[PDB]
Design a protein around this nucleic acid. Structure first.
Lengths: 77, 73
DNA sequence: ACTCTATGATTTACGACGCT
DNA sequence: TAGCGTCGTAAATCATAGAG
């Protein structure tokens, strides 16, 4: 039957999820508080420093801003 | 004290499963639909979003395990 | 109590769409 | 077009409720 057929599916070519380390997370969090939006250069430096791609850093910051939204919605009932 | 995670009561789970299975070909409640389920269940909309995310992947990953449950519903 | 594992929550990675 | 923004989600992983 395959009822999941029309559901959203991950493209078979998506990078497999890699949890970041406590260190990468702590360093990204500190870059976040310095400036919640990355500049092309700051992103470049953080990426190199942590051995993450610039794409991963851009996306981490985007996800971090969505988490901030999630937390603030959880508070302002 | 910090709030602890808890398994949803039988009532909430029945409501969520009811909706899920009645929309099985596309179980994606709209925001307005998540608010109403959240109301009937006594949980938050984030929790309804988490429940559906969790339900779709686990169901998709094991169709057989969730059969029978698909029927009673 | 003390494992285990079920389940709600959180974390990566994207697709689709916005705008400049 | 290049490229970064948000929104919603997939899938993997986490945390620890809770069931023996």
């Amino acid at each position: 039957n395959n009822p999941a057929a029309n559901w959203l599916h991950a493209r078979s070519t998506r990078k497999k999820r890699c949890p970041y380390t406590k260190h990468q997370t702590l360093e990204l969090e500190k870059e976040f508080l310095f400036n919640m939006y990355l500049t092309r250069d700051r992103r470049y430096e953080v990426a190199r420093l942590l051995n993450l791609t610039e794409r991963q850093v851009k996306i981490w910051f985007q996800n971090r801003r969505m988490k901030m939204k999630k937390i603030n919605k959880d508070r302002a009932k | 004290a910090r709030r602890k995670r808890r398994n949803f009561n039988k009532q909430a789970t029945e409501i969520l499963n009811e909706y899920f299975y009645s929309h099985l070909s596309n179980p994606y409640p709209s925001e307005e639909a998540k608010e109403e389920l959240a109301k009937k269940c006594g949980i938050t909309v984030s929790q309804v979003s988490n429940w559906f995310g969790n339900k779709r992947i686990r169901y998709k990953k094991n169709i057989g395990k969730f059969q029978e449950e698909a029927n009673i519903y």
